[PDB]
Amino acid sequence: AEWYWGDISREEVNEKLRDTADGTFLVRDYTLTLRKGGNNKLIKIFHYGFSDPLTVVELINHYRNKLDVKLLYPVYNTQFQEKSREYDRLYEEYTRTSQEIQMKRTAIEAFNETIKIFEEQCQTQERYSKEYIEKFKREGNEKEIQRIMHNYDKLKSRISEIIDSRRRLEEDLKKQAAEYREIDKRMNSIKPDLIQLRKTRDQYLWGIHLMPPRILVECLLPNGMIVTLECLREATLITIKHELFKEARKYPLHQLLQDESSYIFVSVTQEAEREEFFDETRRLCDLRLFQPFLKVIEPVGNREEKILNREIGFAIGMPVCEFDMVKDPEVQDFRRNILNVCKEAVDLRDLNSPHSRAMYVYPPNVESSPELPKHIYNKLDKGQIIVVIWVIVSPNNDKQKYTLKINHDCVPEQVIAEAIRKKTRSMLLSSEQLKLCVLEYQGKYILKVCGCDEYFLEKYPLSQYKYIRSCIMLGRMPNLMLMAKESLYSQLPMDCFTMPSYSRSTKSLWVINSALRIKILCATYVNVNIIDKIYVRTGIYHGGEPLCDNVNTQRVPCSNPRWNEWLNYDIYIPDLPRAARLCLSICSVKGAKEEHCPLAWGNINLFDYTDTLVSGKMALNLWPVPHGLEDLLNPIGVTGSNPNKETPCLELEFDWFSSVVKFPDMSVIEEHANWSVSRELRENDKEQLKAISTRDPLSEITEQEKDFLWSHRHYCVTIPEILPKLLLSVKWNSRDEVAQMYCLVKDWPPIKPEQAMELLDCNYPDPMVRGFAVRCLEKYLTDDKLSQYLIQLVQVLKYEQYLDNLLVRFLLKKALTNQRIGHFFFWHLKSEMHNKTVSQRFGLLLESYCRACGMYLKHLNRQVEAMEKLINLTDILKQEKKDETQKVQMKFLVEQMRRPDFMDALQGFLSPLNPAHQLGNLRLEECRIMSSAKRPLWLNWENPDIMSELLFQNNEIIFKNGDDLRQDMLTLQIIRIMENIWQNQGLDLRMLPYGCLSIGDCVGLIEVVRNSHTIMQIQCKGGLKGALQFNSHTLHQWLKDKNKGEIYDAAIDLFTRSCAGYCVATFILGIGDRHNSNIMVKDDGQLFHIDFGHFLDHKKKKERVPFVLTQDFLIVISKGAQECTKTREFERFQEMCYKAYLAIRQHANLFINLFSMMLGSGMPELQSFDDIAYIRKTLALDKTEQEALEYFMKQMNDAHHGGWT
Ligand SMILES: COc1ccc(-c2cc(CNc3ccc(S(=O)(=O)Nc4nnc(C)s4)cc3)cc(C(=O)O)c2)cn1
Ligand SMILES: COc1ccc(-c2cc(CNc3ccc(S(=O)(=O)Nc4nnc(C)s4)cc3)cc(C(=O)O)c2)cn1
Ligand SMILES: COc1ccc(-c2cc(CNc3ccc(S(=O)(=O)Nc4nnc(C)s4)cc3)cc(C(=O)O)c2)cn1
């Protein structure tokens, strides 16, 4: 048959029905996919009919004759590489030009503020100079007239050079803007052709880095005089102000000047802010002045708040005054209302002082559960662990130690008690005297991990602390230091929280009888080549699902984007769900199959945060299209206008009703729900419900199953984890069904947080659904799990419709009551602030955090400053140094890191990877640029801790610039979760999820693993065997040299086990292709991988086993024999792989969710849901356990050419 496609993937079926007419259909292995109402409906066919009784080609023709009508419509490689390479070259110039334009627009604003201040200076000068010249003229002085006019000559000459500089920059911007539009036009012509060419392929100071040692700054006095003052670059504003007022006595009109104590300095900054400097401690070179000038004004406003606002704006990367001028009431309501969360968190952590404040700053670092897996309890002997308690005596740092043997699960106070028992053994204390000495030490002291800042402040069993637990795993001696609480409490400054200064008829939607219509008026411009026609494509979406077929305006010549057309959507105003959004775009049609492409896009919430339906006329500035998005609309994108107004602006008009239209309140919804039920339980049913709740979030659900789930919706309460599948069964364009769903959700039973997190992704926009998910997290989500999943929870904030919601308030409360959560809460937000889509939401949330976070803001600012100097330095190497040989680059590195300004910033701060790790003085001999192509930085710090010798004496981080490390973070997160699953199932497989943190745009930090080498580095320690060929046995021989004696077997074991872990994990996730420089081995034999920046389907345009065991690894697993495949050790290696693969398959739902919550980000290789489907295929979810294991073997076989059977 013509419409029978046999076996084809769901992703391929969606591609054929995309943007088609209602009635389009096909059939596959049976399964009938039908296009209705803008969606693709799935109608199953049983071996034939749709439902009992069964009455094949026969029934398909009968229906060609809920769902109304259907069955109308059944369903060079050198040129693609030539067009694709050109497109990527234009995209490079497109983003560089886009970024350079932003810096210029900011510099124009700095020029405007500068010229405004200088124009004020001329006015005040003309004011005072006017009256005193007339007096001096009357008196015939003529010396004072000349002196005044002499200073006015310099002022007028100075202000003219600034106006000339602004005019010169405006013209350069005007030129580069026109160049940006042309680049935009060239890419808009290639997009349709490049897609078509690929489809057929498949068918077969400002500007000055630093100030000079002495600099000349022009001080603008309130009497109108401009005075030149030579300053040391490091001089404080205190010194500058005092010297300035000595020099002012040499200038005319001195007597008008008040005392210097009555004034402060104001100036302009590289961020184009007009900044009053209330803190006069600050050095001149640290002010980030736009130009070298200062204006003397009288201070206005609260001193302490202005000082704090500067510190906040530095951490945020944006001036706080920019939020003051936003006229959007939702923005100003969020700033004021979110302070309620700040006050609760501050009140909660101060409840029992100092202790609860210490619990906030140094929260216990602890595993999820006290229960130890069986093989871990066997590592410790008899149930007891040997720990070393250290005491510091005398100012000389001399340290006495006491070795204890105690139960693994005994608490920290019981450990301290045993230290006292061992010390007092010979003192012959009575039973009561021993109790008194133990109670004193338990009260006066706590335990601290030697080598970092980590403390046991809480009653958790000792084996549950991450540090002790790690020691048990690794077979290392725990080293703890006895420390007085009074020393820890003075280490925490008591801080107070001050409220900022900004703390101070209608109608019903369901009443309107009418359909939904929106008028498209016109667009200011678009960038296209005179492409044939353009049009505005619109649609109404709930989540990613359309609520009705898309509606287009009429086509119009590119020269004239005017429509003035009413678009009629099929849907009923009372049927419009609360979370419905309007998604629209401007598209072009090249004249040929009519290739379409999306010039620009934008989204709108059809109800504002007050539940008001949009009305009247609206102007919407649109957004550039994301890199690899070929769809004509972008429902995942963020709502709201583009803050950049230099971009195409579409004008809309919304239907008007006699008054304001509001969404109904809950009492009317429930009353409507009872009205719908009024006008409207077998063993196999209970088993089908159980079966539907097990399948993965991305599994297909037919229409017969959606009706089955909805008919049984009242019985679904007994299987609460089925809720996501039930929500998909709802018709969200019917208020009758949504009203009933609300009455279920409010009473719905709670569910596990890992399951509730799914309801926070882009598929579940509804407020009631989302509010239910957050209440689930509020009760059942521990601070440990919240830390693990924090990258996903921060990501789903983007899909929230409004600034003020339940999820934001939950996360901010937790960040402000837990400083380990707050640290990464801050950095996850700060890294995306470059992204203008989320920059306002995240900027506002960082402000609220920084106000209530307490004394930690000083430490965060220290980290932000240090990262800025590393970003600046590495960006220089990317541009200037990009050519010259690495021998020269290292000369520039050692020279730049030697600057005392650089040295002060990069020494004595906390590692953003692990705030518990203090970063001391840099060891510069160890600092280098790595020899890899991307040329990242290798940085080495001393550990300042007195006990550092017992943990590590050097901290090493890789600072990598130019790659997006959010993908590494997701992989390393998944690696860690995979290991915890395997560990709790009795499989001991060591994985190495080293720390990775993205601090900005394609910039971040990576933890260095000590005592590790790449396979390449190890083969080079060896020698050649065949012609121009490394020896296959070098790796195995190297491990023999590192592990000799009885420890040899332990290394081969650890090698084989860790090798099994990265075989399974790498195959499941589709990690980028492995090679000898991204694979590594420790001295003990533990194997791990690096360079995780690729995952899933990324080779789709251009599956596979990334990690392929070569002769080198098989020699180690089999302990150096010949024919490694036939050995019993390689069989045992395969068993580990098979068992570890099935373990992940059972947990598949968790990992699919983790990827789904990340869709909103700009990660290049995670774009649509079809990218996540790669994991469905590698885990063989739609298959069965027996078949899925056979699937894994066949993939390993084909990649290794035999050996698996
Ligand atoms: C259970 O559903 C509802 C929805 C709204 C109201 C409702 C309406 C109004 C005023 N709006 C309105 C407009 C058109 C007509 S119609 O009869 O001429 N057309 C039609 N009839 N059935 C359809 C189907 S469409 C009636 C009312 C007011 C109130 C109220 O006063 O509470 C409630 C009551 N129940
Ligand atoms: C769009 O305009 C419409 C839509 C539907 C209807 C409509 C009226 C009726 C009349 N009876 C009726 C039934 C239920 C209740 S309720 O209080 O329980 N629900 C609610 N109240 N205010 C709202 C608001 S919705 C109130 C009146 C019946 C029907 C019908 O059942 O088809 C439709 C009327 N206008
Ligand atoms: C994590 O512990 C590590 C990691 C790497 C090295 C290491 C690697 C190499 C050569 N391999 C290599 C491959 C990829 C890149 S990357 O910049 O493109 N991405 C990334 N880098 N680290 C990650 C992590 S991901 C850099 C180097 C050489 C050396 C060395 O020079 O000693 C150390 C040592 N310890």
Side-chain angles (χ1 to χ4, degrees), residues 1 3-6 8-10 13-14 17 19-28 30-35 37-40 42-43 45-46 48-54 56-57 59 61-63 65 67 72-75 79-80 86-88 90-91 93-98 100-115 117-125 128 131-133 135-136 138-141 144-145 147-155 157-160 162-170 172-173 176-178 180-185 187-195 198 200 202 205-207 209 211-213 215-248 250-270 272-299 301-305 307-324 326 328-342 344-370 372-373 375-378 380 383-391 393-395 398 401-404 406-430 433-434 436-458 460-475 477-485 487-493 495 497-503 506-530 532-558 560-561 563-589 591-592 594 596-616 618-657 659-678 683-685 688-689 691-710 712-714 716-730 732-751 753-778 780-854 856-877 883-884 886 888-890 892-894 896-898 900 902-922 924-930 933-934 936-945 947-1009 1011-1020 1022-1024 1026-1039 1041-1043 1045 1047-1098 1103-1121 1124-1125 1127 1129-1138 1140-1145 1147-1176 1178-1182 1184-1185 1187-1193 1195-1205:
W3 34 254
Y4 172 63
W5 284 77
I8 56 172
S9 66
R10 179 192 184 180
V13 176
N14 288 329
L17 297 199
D19 296 325
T20 60
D22 279 12
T24 317
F25 78 91
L26 51 78
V27 184
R28 71 183 198 274
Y30 293 86
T31 287
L32 167 63
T33 309
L34 171 61
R35 179 85 170 181
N39 298 277
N40 304 331
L42 204 69
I43 310 297
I45 309 177
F46 314 82
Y48 298 93
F50 290 140
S51 62
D52 289 331
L54 305 182
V56 77
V57 189
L59 85 95
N61 306 133
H62 158 45
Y63 287 129
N65 60 262
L67 313 166
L72 309 186
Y73 319 91
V75 180
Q79 298 175 358
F80 164 73
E86 184 190 353
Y87 182 87
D88 283 279
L90 283 173
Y91 188 67
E93 194 177 7
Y94 175 86
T95 54
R96 179 184 63 80
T97 303
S98 178
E100 288 181 19
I101 285 173
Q102 180 61 72
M103 300 180 71
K104 290 188 183 183
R105 300 231 177 89
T106 290
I108 297 292
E109 292 305 321
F111 268 115
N112 292 332
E113 281 296 335
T114 297
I115 295 171
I117 290 168
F118 271 85
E119 283 182 351
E120 292 168 9
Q121 197 66 17
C122 293
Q123 283 181 295
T124 65
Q125 200 283 341
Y128 293 96
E131 221 62 30
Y132 283 88
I133 289 175
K135 170 172 176 296
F136 293 141
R138 234 174 193 273
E139 300 173 348
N141 196 308
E144 292 299 324
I145 294 175
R147 291 178 70 232
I148 289 178
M149 294 280 87
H150 175 80
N151 196 259
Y152 170 88
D153 283 8
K154 297 206 267 191
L155 177 53
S157 184
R158 184 76 71 189
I159 191 174
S160 291
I162 305 176
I163 293 175
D164 281 332
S165 284
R166 181 181 68 184
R167 190 188 298 99
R168 173 165 276 279
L169 186 58
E170 286 177 6
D172 284 329
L173 175 61
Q176 195 172 32
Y180 171 85
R181 297 195 201 90
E182 290 298 322
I183 298 166
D184 201 20
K185 288 177 185 174
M187 299 177 71
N188 289 344
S189 295
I190 298 178
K191 266 170 178 289
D193 296 328
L194 185 51
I195 293 171
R198 189 198 63 190
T200 69
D202 290 24
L205 295 181
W206 173 72
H209 208 251
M211 287 182 177
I215 184 175
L216 290 178
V217 54
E218 297 273 57
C219 310
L220 277 51
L221 295 183
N223 63 5
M225 301 302 101
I226 172 170
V227 296
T228 287
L229 189 57
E230 177 168 11
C231 297
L232 289 171
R233 70 178 291 268
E234 306 89 0
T236 63
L237 290 179
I238 290 177
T239 302
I240 290 177
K241 192 173 68 177
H242 185 68
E243 289 297 324
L244 171 55
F245 277 71
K246 290 177 194 165
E247 187 70 5
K250 304 179 186 178
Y251 285 76
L253 274 46
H254 170 79
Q255 58 271 11
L256 301 167
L257 303 175
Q258 308 174 29
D259 195 88
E260 55 194 90
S261 65
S262 298
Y263 299 111
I264 64 158
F265 287 119
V266 77
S267 181
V268 182
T269 66
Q270 301 168 8
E273 176 186 11
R274 180 189 206 269
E275 172 175 347
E276 314 170 80
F277 307 96
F278 281 86
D279 186 352
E280 301 185 331
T281 307
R282 298 173 61 199
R283 310 183 310 170
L284 174 65
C285 54
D286 297 337
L287 311 179
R288 325 177 81 196
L289 295 179
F290 174 63
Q291 302 254 42
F293 78 92
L294 302 171
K295 180 198 191 59
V296 171
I297 68 171
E298 296 190 86
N302 185 255
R303 177 189 152 81
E304 286 67 24
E305 181 172 332
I307 291 167
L308 177 60
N309 287 347
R310 204 281 306 176
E311 302 176 21
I312 294 173
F314 185 95
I316 279 176
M318 165 193 299
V320 148
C321 64
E322 286 185 0
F323 293 132
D324 287 326
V326 181
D328 189 337
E330 187 180 356
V331 168
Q332 304 304 336
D333 289 327
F334 174 88
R335 293 182 80 190
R336 178 177 52 261
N337 296 323
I338 199 68
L339 298 169
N340 298 319
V341 178
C342 299
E344 290 182 20
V346 171
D347 290 342
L348 183 50
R349 69 198 194 202
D350 294 344
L351 194 56
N352 182 27
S353 202
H355 172 71
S356 61
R357 290 176 170 170
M359 286 290 285
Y360 166 53
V361 166
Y362 305 109
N365 189 23
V366 65
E367 295 285 0
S368 305
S369 162
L372 293 181
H375 57 261
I376 298 184
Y377 184 80
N378 302 331
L380 51 87
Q384 298 186 321
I385 177 176
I386 298 181
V387 303
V388 185
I389 309 302
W390 294 84
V391 169
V393 293
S394 90
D398 297 27
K401 74 174 194 171
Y402 299 85
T403 305
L404 310 181
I406 38 88
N407 296 331
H408 73 92
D409 60 337
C410 82
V411 298
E413 300 196 347
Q414 285 172 342
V415 174
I416 295 179
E418 286 287 343
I420 287 296
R421 180 220 66 95
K422 188 166 181 297
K423 179 66 178 187
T424 57
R425 54 152 78 91
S426 301
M427 301 180 62
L428 305 185
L429 305 170
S430 63
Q433 283 299 321
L434 176 56
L436 236 57
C437 187
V438 169
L439 288 179
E440 188 200 22
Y441 272 72
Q442 292 176 344
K444 204 171 188 174
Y445 296 100
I446 42 84
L447 293 174
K448 171 186 181 299
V449 174
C450 302
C452 56
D453 301 344
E454 198 155 305
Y455 301 84
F456 318 141
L457 306 180
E458 197 54 274
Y460 295 93
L462 200 74
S463 76
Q464 205 182 333
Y465 280 94
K466 290 269 228 294
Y467 171 75
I468 270 81
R469 179 73 69 89
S470 178
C471 287
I472 300 173
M473 291 288 298
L474 306 182
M477 196 74 66
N479 289 279
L480 316 176
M481 174 177 162
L482 195 64
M483 170 174 293
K485 303 181 183 177
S487 298
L488 179 68
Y489 294 153
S490 57
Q491 181 178 141
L492 293 194
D495 51 54
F497 169 78
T498 288
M499 283 290 191
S501 73
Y502 58 76
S503 66
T506 62
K507 194 171 186 177
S508 168
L509 180 86
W510 288 5
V511 146
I512 289 115
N513 188 8
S514 174
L516 183 77
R517 63 174 190 152
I518 300 169
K519 194 178 186 180
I520 312 299
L521 295 175
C522 64
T524 61
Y525 74 99
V526 294
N527 298 329
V528 294
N529 191 336
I530 311 293
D532 289 46
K533 306 288 191 171
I534 65 176
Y535 66 98
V536 177
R537 176 165 193 90
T538 76
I540 314 299
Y541 281 75
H542 183 268
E545 168 192 52
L547 298 168
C548 54
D549 210 344
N550 296 152
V551 183
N552 295 339
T553 64
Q554 312 205 45
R555 299 180 181 188
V556 194
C558 309
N560 181 32
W563 291 274
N564 271 83
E565 177 186 2
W566 281 100
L567 302 189
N568 300 287
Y569 305 88
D570 171 40
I571 184 167
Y572 196 44
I573 263 59
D575 276 330
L576 198 62
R578 178 64 187 70
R581 299 176 311 113
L582 170 63
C583 304
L584 47 78
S585 72
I586 299 178
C587 307
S588 84
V589 178
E594 271 197 355
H596 292 259
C597 83
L599 303 175
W601 69 275
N603 294 342
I604 287 165
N605 295 314
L606 291 171
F607 297 91
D608 72 1
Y609 73 120
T610 64
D611 317 309
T612 302
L613 171 67
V614 301
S615 67
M618 179 178 302
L620 184 73
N621 288 90
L622 308 178
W623 297 89
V625 179
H627 187 221
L629 176 60
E630 304 179 352
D631 292 323
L632 304 181
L633 293 177
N634 193 30
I636 299 177
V638 72
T639 55
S641 181
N642 186 339
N644 173 14
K645 308 303 177 183
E646 289 299 323
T647 65
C649 179
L650 178 77
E651 285 172 42
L652 307 177
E653 186 180 338
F654 293 107
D655 194 10
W656 167 245
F657 307 103
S659 57
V660 178
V661 176
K662 272 202 179 304
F663 201 83
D665 58 90
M666 195 59 60
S667 71
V668 177
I669 292 166
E670 296 171 344
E671 203 176 356
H672 184 90
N674 291 337
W675 184 257
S676 301
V677 179
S678 301
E683 271 301 318
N684 273 15
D685 298 343
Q688 186 179 1
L689 292 173
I692 291 172
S693 69
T694 55
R695 64 176 61 162
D696 62 277
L698 297 190
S699 188
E700 305 171 330
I701 165 172
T702 73
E703 292 288 294
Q704 296 94 336
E705 286 171 327
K706 288 181 188 177
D707 298 338
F708 170 79
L709 292 168
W710 176 252
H712 292 58
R713 60 185 177 275
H714 280 296
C716 289
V717 159
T718 68
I719 310 112
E721 61 278 6
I722 205 174
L723 177 59
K725 300 292 176 187
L726 175 56
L727 293 165
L728 300 184
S729 307
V730 177
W732 293 91
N733 58 358
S734 172
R735 59 154 165 172
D736 293 351
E737 291 193 16
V738 174
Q740 290 184 62
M741 183 48 64
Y742 283 170
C743 299
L744 284 168
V745 167
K746 67 179 177 78
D747 289 282
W748 201 267
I751 58 177
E754 286 84 352
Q755 295 164 333
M757 277 165 50
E758 177 179 358
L759 305 177
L760 295 173
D761 69 35
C762 60
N763 276 327
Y764 301 99
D766 180 83
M768 295 293 298
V769 177
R770 291 190 142 250
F772 161 82
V774 172
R775 292 192 308 274
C776 285
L777 301 193
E778 278 175 333
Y780 305 102
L781 183 68
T782 62
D783 289 12
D784 161 73
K785 287 290 183 182
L786 174 53
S787 281
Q788 235 196 4
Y789 301 122
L790 186 53
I791 59 166
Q792 279 88 13
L793 297 176
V794 163
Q795 213 58 226
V796 294
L797 291 177
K798 303 178 176 191
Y799 320 122
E800 288 286 344
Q801 273 190 287
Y802 314 109
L803 297 169
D804 199 349
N805 59 78
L806 296 181
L807 176 55
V808 182
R809 294 170 169 257
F810 169 70
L811 295 178
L812 182 53
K813 187 209 189 69
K814 280 296 188 167
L816 289 170
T817 55
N818 186 315
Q819 200 154 270
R820 168 164 58 246
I821 291 173
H823 168 81
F824 294 99
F825 181 77
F826 168 87
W827 275 110
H828 294 337
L829 296 168
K830 166 77 166 180
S831 45
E832 300 234 9
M833 286 299 297
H834 69 275
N835 184 345
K836 278 294 194 301
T837 64
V838 297
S839 73
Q840 182 179 72
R841 180 197 291 278
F842 285 4
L844 287 169
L845 180 56
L846 281 167
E847 180 187 32
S848 64
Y849 170 78
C850 287
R851 291 203 180 277
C853 76
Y856 193 51
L857 184 59
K858 257 99 177 194
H859 294 107
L860 282 177
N861 270 335
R862 276 296 304 262
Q863 303 167 25
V864 173
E865 189 185 43
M867 294 306 98
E868 236 188 56
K869 304 216 167 302
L870 291 174
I871 295 171
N872 288 335
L873 179 55
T874 55
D875 269 345
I876 284 172
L877 301 174
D883 301 328
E884 53 205 1
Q886 179 178 338
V888 179
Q889 283 191 0
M890 271 293 290
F892 174 75
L893 184 79
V894 65
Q896 280 294 86
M897 299 177 69
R898 197 183 300 157
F902 187 100
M903 293 282 294
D904 289 336
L906 263 83
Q907 299 180 147
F909 71 102
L910 305 182
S911 170
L913 290 167
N914 200 331
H917 297 162
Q918 286 175 1
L919 295 184
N921 294 312
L922 281 171
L924 295 164
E925 58 279 6
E926 317 288 333
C927 287
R928 63 177 201 276
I929 301 170
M930 299 180 64
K934 295 163 191 161
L937 286 187
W938 186 284
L939 301 172
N940 186 102
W941 289 272
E942 289 186 14
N943 190 338
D945 196 48
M947 299 256 55
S948 60
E949 62 278 13
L950 293 170
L951 189 67
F952 47 89
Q953 274 179 324
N954 288 277
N955 218 7
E956 295 167 291
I957 308 177
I958 288 175
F959 184 92
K960 189 178 175 188
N961 193 332
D963 272 14
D964 187 348
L965 291 178
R966 300 181 293 169
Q967 302 199 167
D968 293 76
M969 294 172 60
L970 182 59
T971 300
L972 298 168
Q973 174 188 61
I974 291 165
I975 280 178
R976 180 178 299 274
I977 294 176
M978 284 184 172
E979 191 185 354
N980 288 336
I981 297 167
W982 292 330
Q983 222 67 30
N984 265 274
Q985 287 199 5
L987 285 175
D988 195 334
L989 305 173
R990 278 205 207 170
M991 311 291 280
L992 201 151
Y994 51 79
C996 177
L997 183 62
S998 157
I999 59 168
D1001 188 351
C1002 291
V1003 163
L1005 309 162
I1006 313 173
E1007 182 191 359
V1008 169
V1009 182
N1011 302 306
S1012 60
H1013 310 73
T1014 72
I1015 272 65
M1016 171 105 75
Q1017 289 165 340
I1018 294 158
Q1019 289 177 327
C1020 293
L1024 309 176
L1028 297 183
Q1029 189 176 359
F1030 284 133
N1031 184 9
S1032 297
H1033 287 256
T1034 299
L1035 174 67
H1036 176 215
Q1037 178 51 46
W1038 179 80
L1039 284 179
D1041 302 337
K1042 282 295 181 180
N1043 303 257
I1047 61 177
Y1048 168 85
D1049 301 276
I1052 299 295
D1053 195 42
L1054 179 58
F1055 188 96
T1056 307
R1057 293 177 179 273
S1058 62
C1059 197
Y1062 280 94
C1063 268
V1064 178
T1066 305
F1067 167 79
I1068 291 172
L1069 297 172
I1071 306 300
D1073 284 324
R1074 294 299 86 185
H1075 55 60
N1076 288 336
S1077 289
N1078 60 36
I1079 306 173
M1080 299 196 69
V1081 188
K1082 287 174 69 70
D1083 290 342
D1084 57 7
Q1086 178 176 5
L1087 185 147
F1088 63 99
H1089 291 179
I1090 60 178
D1091 194 343
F1092 285 120
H1094 293 265
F1095 52 37
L1096 298 174
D1097 200 26
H1098 51 91
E1103 60 286 1
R1104 51 183 203 93
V1105 178
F1107 189 20
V1108 184
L1109 307 189
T1110 66
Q1111 193 65 16
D1112 298 70
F1113 307 104
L1114 297 177
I1115 285 169
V1116 185
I1117 293 171
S1118 64
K1119 296 180 187 165
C1124 314
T1125 302
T1127 74
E1129 284 92 344
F1130 179 72
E1131 180 181 12
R1132 187 178 78 104
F1133 167 83
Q1134 289 169 308
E1135 285 188 33
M1136 290 176 183
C1137 290
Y1138 300 154
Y1141 173 85
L1142 297 185
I1144 303 308
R1145 235 183 64 96
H1147 290 274
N1149 311 267
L1150 176 57
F1151 301 103
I1152 290 184
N1153 280 336
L1154 289 170
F1155 279 98
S1156 297
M1157 303 175 70
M1158 302 299 297
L1159 273 180
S1161 25
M1163 296 205 284
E1165 298 175 7
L1166 189 56
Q1167 299 197 55
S1168 61
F1169 280 106
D1170 296 338
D1171 288 326
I1172 303 179
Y1174 185 85
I1175 279 201
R1176 304 185 78 262
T1178 59
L1179 294 169
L1181 300 178
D1182 296 325
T1184 61
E1185 183 144 271
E1187 307 171 303
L1189 185 53
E1190 295 177 5
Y1191 168 83
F1192 182 83
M1193 296 175 59
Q1195 301 311 302
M1196 301 302 276
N1197 237 338
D1198 288 24
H1200 301 95
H1201 307 94
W1204 300 66
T1205 293

